[PDB]
Amino acid sequence: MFEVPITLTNRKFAQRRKLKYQYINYISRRFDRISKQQKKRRRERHWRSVSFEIWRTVSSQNKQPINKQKMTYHNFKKIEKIPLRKMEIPLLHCTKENKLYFQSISRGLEPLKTSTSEVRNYRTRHIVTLTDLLHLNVSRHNWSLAYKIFATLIRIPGVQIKSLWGIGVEILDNLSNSSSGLDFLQWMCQIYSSKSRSIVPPFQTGSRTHTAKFAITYLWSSLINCQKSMLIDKISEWVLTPPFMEDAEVWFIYASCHLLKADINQVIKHIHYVRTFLKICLDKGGFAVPSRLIENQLKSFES
Amino acid sequence: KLIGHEAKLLFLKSFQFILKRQIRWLITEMRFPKEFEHVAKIIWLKILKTINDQPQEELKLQLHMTSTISILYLASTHLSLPVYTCDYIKWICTAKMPYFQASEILRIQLPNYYVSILEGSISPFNGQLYNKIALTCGMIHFKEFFNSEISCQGLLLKLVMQCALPPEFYFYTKQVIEFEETDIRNLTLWERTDERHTGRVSNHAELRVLSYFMLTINWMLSFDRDRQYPLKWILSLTESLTQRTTTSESIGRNIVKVVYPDKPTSSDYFQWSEEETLEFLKWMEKQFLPTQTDQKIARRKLYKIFPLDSTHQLTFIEDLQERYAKQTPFFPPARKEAIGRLLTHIASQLLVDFAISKEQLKDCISRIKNACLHRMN
Amino acid sequence: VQGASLYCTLAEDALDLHIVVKSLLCDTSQYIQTASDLRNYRDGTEIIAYASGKTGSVLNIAVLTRQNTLHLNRHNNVTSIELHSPIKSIKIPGASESIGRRSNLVGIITENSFQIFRIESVHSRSCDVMVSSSEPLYFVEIDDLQVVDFQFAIIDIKGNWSIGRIPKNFNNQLIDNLHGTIFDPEELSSWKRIEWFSHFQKILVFDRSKMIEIDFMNNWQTEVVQAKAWSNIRDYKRIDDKNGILLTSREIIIVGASESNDPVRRISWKHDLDPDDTTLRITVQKVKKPDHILLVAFVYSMRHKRIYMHVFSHRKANLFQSLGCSTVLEIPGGTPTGIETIFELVVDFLVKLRNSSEVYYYALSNTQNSIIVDHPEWASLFNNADEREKESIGALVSQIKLKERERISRVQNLIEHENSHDEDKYLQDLGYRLSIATNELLESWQKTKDESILSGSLSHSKLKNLLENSDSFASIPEFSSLLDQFFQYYQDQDVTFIGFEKLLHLFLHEDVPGLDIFYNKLLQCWVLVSPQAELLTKEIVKDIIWSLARLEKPSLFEPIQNEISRSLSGPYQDIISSWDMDD
């Protein structure tokens, strides 16, 4: 009854995706008319958005001024009447269950059974139980067992997992053995920052534009591994190393490394340094203290 | 690269090879008799001769894995060995007997049409096994060629011990058995088709045995006008049956519960405990090495970054003994409740163990229950 | 982390979970847009009075019947006798809203149907609940309506909405003048949703594609920041406090809510939850404490009776954090059609399951300091009806019971004679009597030996038609010795061999070397449990050893004849394929 860390068993789900987005195309096409191939599926699924430290959202202002009813019964069934027969053509090619699914989603009914609930393989089900016991043990502070789970798992050939935040916080709270959360993260960036879809929201990502969660969390959490101190020029040495320019958060990490190193003219250069990176961190989507507060610490320094 | 249109020959070679591989594992690791192998060459020989008495270049064969298990059970049943379908289901779902792959990860590259003809239809779990053994029992005829009487009485023993029933129920159910059948049990349910709709939910002998077993318990216990079986000991029986304890067997039934199609049994894995999960991951790293299908050395060092790395739990007759004792205190209309919950737990175990459906079982025991009322009234 | 080292790694807290407390309350593939049951407390009189917790429950043949009745609360939460009403339409959501405490504790209750949209008033006194039917409108539109929100009757029909008002008490009905639409041709699923936001007199409108805010007493419309690339809006319910918003996507619990007087989105980060299930829904309960204000998120389904729970907290700096996940189960077949909420946590709600007219109160607690089977599929199989089908079963039971008595008294004396010279005579004339019959059957196996069509010689594995000779002995070890010396005797070749021990392996699941130790182990087990366990265990080890007692076709040299000869009639290169010893 929980998400599975495997690529979903295939055929029928994909041909259903076909029927769905194809009919979607015909209805929305005729809709814009009335307002006036893997690749066809690709363009189709394509043109669509794919007191505490709250990474705040974008609130409501500078947005439209309503709409008034577009869709009566007669007018909708006008738009619907034709694309449903076009659908009658390839429905004849798909399977009877698939056809039924097309009929029901197109009535607007939502299917009883999940993709998992109708899925149907030994090795993958075993990996499912393995990974599950990993996540469970890591939740249970059972770092020993959890470590055994992790080693036995990574042994397997079967699936790569984005599951990466699972292992970041996993090895993090594990402390037990294996080349740790930082090693995993910098591995993620080294393998997936070069040319060398379904599964992917933001908490696991590709290094064209922002890989977010794991990177910023090893960044901050490493600066807290300096809270262990009072390592920094290391953390910002390998935050210096990568080019993935849409961050700024590593600009505030950088300027935080300079404020932490500023705690004689050397200390001056560190304070001018943080003064610089706070503005080249006004470069991008802002991380802001009132920042006259940042400067006020910097004047407590100017003492 | 790969064969075209006469990879019938290669297909039947990976298939036959996989069969003899499984036989190797069951004489070796299950201490079968060497005669089994000859019985297998005879049955696989009969149906091989029947599919090579068939013309078409269009293959029309289905050598799914259910056919492997089908001729193994067929041969075992001729030889009157006390192995039953649930032995096979357990054996294969616990990765002991190699099954869930084409020529498991290590072989041959065949036309993807046949790799699909292998990997497909893999599950036995809705009675696919009973249906495929009856189908083979048509494909070459059971009657004259072989002796298709099931090993009934060992199944009764297996069943009483599988519950914690006192040995009187072996003779009880053996008697109801004799009452409706007089002990004649066949293997074919064949009239080659898909089509069937009455008379033939219940003519795989086993399923009827389980049906008689259930019935027996219900009748027997609900009409002990003697009061031989206490209103309590039915509860204590239910609880000694219910207490999840870690023997090879129950651990196995958990492993089968994981790949049984229907809920609840997966909610059953939900209600398991850290040691069950642990021995599970153990069986995962052991028997899911029987898996299927620069950067590589980078993953040998990458995985080699984190280390790959007075006997506690008890045997079968130990557990059996101890619940037989847990009820050893042996010497009013809501006792029907105790009868019902006991029957339904027993049912659950049978459903996962004999890979059938809730609805399948109750169809059978319903039909054959009316088949006893009819020859009783 | 964020604030701890913005200031200049385990948790907040240790690990606590879920427990139950259960009670009965009242009794009555493609799915669609519906959800139909409520309970909420108001008092009509407001001549300085209090609120009354009421239920709007649903009665079904066709779902024609709407029922309103009171709840008296306690630690034991019951009802008092029922009050009723019908409608000719199939009935969908009962909803009774309540604007938060900018103002007042609210009046009466509304429902959406198959055609109609109705709103009722109520007066009540002395354990009766008399309601009045504020008038329906079957439609202007020939369009079904998705959601009602609330004095303002707001309707949504698939892709177009209307703000409306309700009449005052009596008997003029409900009118509207402000309208709109969110129509989207390329979203096929029918459910849309209207619930407003901040009580600002500004609304929220939803479909599985997107979330649109509409400031509806000016002219204002916005599509808030995501759309439909990777997930569907799955549900939304206003976490009760006016400025508070709870939205289930796929794989995300979203806590929207204003942190500005104008309407909002919150991207104050969120938790995620893991399916493809279309049928997910959500509801929150809200508990109050000194240092925080915490919210429990119940996401439930129509597929599995499990409940998926997460918890958030409102330390009013508009501080929100998340702790860790937990999930509970629920019972037989079916699934929730309704979940409704009202150093430890108590959270309590009611559930109604798919196709079960029952309404069950539940309560959940943190720690521990302090099946009644009607499976209609099996009871129909166990209780069978007519009286002659009761005394029928009893008749059969008696038949076998006295039979078992015959078994006991019969075998008893056979147990009296063990190691006797009598049982010795019997084991002799038995063993080699059987040997004579076995030889005869071997001769009639010689006459038919040249069959070469099969390799199963007919009706073989037996005592071979002398049946009384089996039973009468009663000493397992001397019988095992009989069989060992019978196998010894027929060692004259071309004869079956099969080793039992290696097969009892399958029976007791450990190595069973001797035919005797088999009897020992069974005898321990059953001597714990039955009288004459020695008699039965002996009778059943005899029955097993007989049921297996081999005598199959002439041995290994005989099968290879038919092996090769069937390997002949087959065409030539299937014959070339037939392959022993692979690798």
From Swiss-Prot, chain A:
Pfam families the record matches: Rrn11 (PF04090)
Alphabetical GO biological process terms: nucleolar large rRNA transcription by RNA polymerase I
Chief site of localization: nucleus
Keywords from the named record: Nucleus, Transcription, Transcription regulation
Highest taxon above the source species: Eukaryota
One of the record's GO cellular component terms: nucleus
InterPro entries, A to Z: RNA_pol_I-specific_init_factor (IPR053029), TIF_Rrn11 (IPR007224), TIF_Rrn11_budding_yeast (IPR016850)
Miscellaneous notes: Present with 476 molecules/cell in log phase SD medium.
Subunit structure of this chain's protein: Component of the core factor (CF) complex, which consists of RRN6, RRN7 and RRN11. The CF heterotrimer may further dimerize to form a hexamer. RRN11 interacts with RRN6, RRN7 and SPT15.
Protein name according to UniProt: RNA polymerase I-specific transcription initiation factor RRN11
Gene symbol of the encoding locus: RRN11
Curated annotation (Swiss-Prot), chain B:
Keyword DNA-binding belongs to the record: yes
Gene Ontology cellular component annotations, sorted alphabetically: nucleolus; nucleus; RNA polymerase I core factor complex
Intrachain disulfide bonds: none
Gene Ontology BP annotations: nucleolar large rRNA transcription by RNA polymerase I
Subcellular location: Nucleus, Nucleolus
Molecular-function GO term, any one: TBP-class protein binding
Residue ranges of the region described as N-terminal cyclin fold: 9-113
Domain of life: Eukaryota
Quaternary structure annotation from Swiss-Prot or TrEMBL: Component of the core factor (CF) complex, which consists of RRN6, RRN7 and RRN11. The CF heterotrimer may further dimerize to form a hexamer. RRN7 interacts with RRN6, RRN11, SPT15 and RRN9.
Functional summary from the UniProt entry: Component of RNA polymerase I core factor complex (CF) that acts as a SUA7/TFIIB-like factor and plays a key role in multiple steps during transcription initiation such as pre-initiation complex (PIC) assembly and postpolymerase recruitment events in polymerase I (Pol I) transcription. Binds rDNA promoters and plays a role in Pol I recruitment. After binding of UAF (upstream activation factor) to an upstream element of the promoter, CF is recruited in a SPT15/TBP-dependent manner to form a pre-initiation complex.
Family: Belongs to the RRN7/TAF1B family.
Other remarks in the entry: Present with 398 molecules/cell in log phase SD medium.
Domain notes: Although it shares weak sequence similarity with SUA7/TFIIB, displays a similar subdomain organization as SUA7/TFIIB, with a N-terminal zinc finger, a connecting region (composed of B-reader and B-linker regions), followed by 2 cyclin folds.
Protein name: RNA polymerase I-specific transcription initiation factor RRN7
Organism name: Saccharomyces cerevisiae (strain ATCC 204508 / S288c)
Taxon lineage: Eukaryota, Fungi, Dikarya, Ascomycota, Saccharomycotina
Gene name per UniProt: RRN7
Range covered out of full length: 94 to 514 of 514
From Swiss-Prot, chain C:
Function (record text): Acts as a component of the core factor (CF) complex which is essential for the initiation of rDNA transcription by RNA polymerase I. After binding of UAF (upstream activation factor) to an upstream element of the promoter, CF is recruited in a SPT15/TBP-dependent manner to form a preinitiation complex.
One Pfam family linked to the record: Rrn6_beta-prop
GO biological process: nucleolar large rRNA transcription by RNA polymerase I; transcription initiation at RNA polymerase I promoter
Single Gene Ontology MF annotation: RNA polymerase I general transcription initiation factor binding
Signal peptide range in chain numbering: none
This protein's UniProt keywords: Cytoplasm, Nucleus, Transcription, Transcription regulation
Database matches in InterPro entries: RNA_pol_I-sp_TIF_RRN6-like, Rrn6, RRN6_beta-prop, RRN6_HB, Rrn6_K-rich
GO cellular component, one term: nucleus
Keyword Cell cycle tagged: no
Further comment found in the protein's record: Present with 237 molecules/cell in log phase SD medium.
The protein's name: RNA polymerase I-specific transcription initiation factor RRN6
Compartments where found: Cytoplasm; Nucleus, Nucleolus
Subunit structure: Component of the core factor (CF) complex, which consists of RRN6, RRN7 and RRN11. The CF heterotrimer may further dimerize to form a hexamer. RRN6 interacts with RRN7, RRN11 and RRN9.
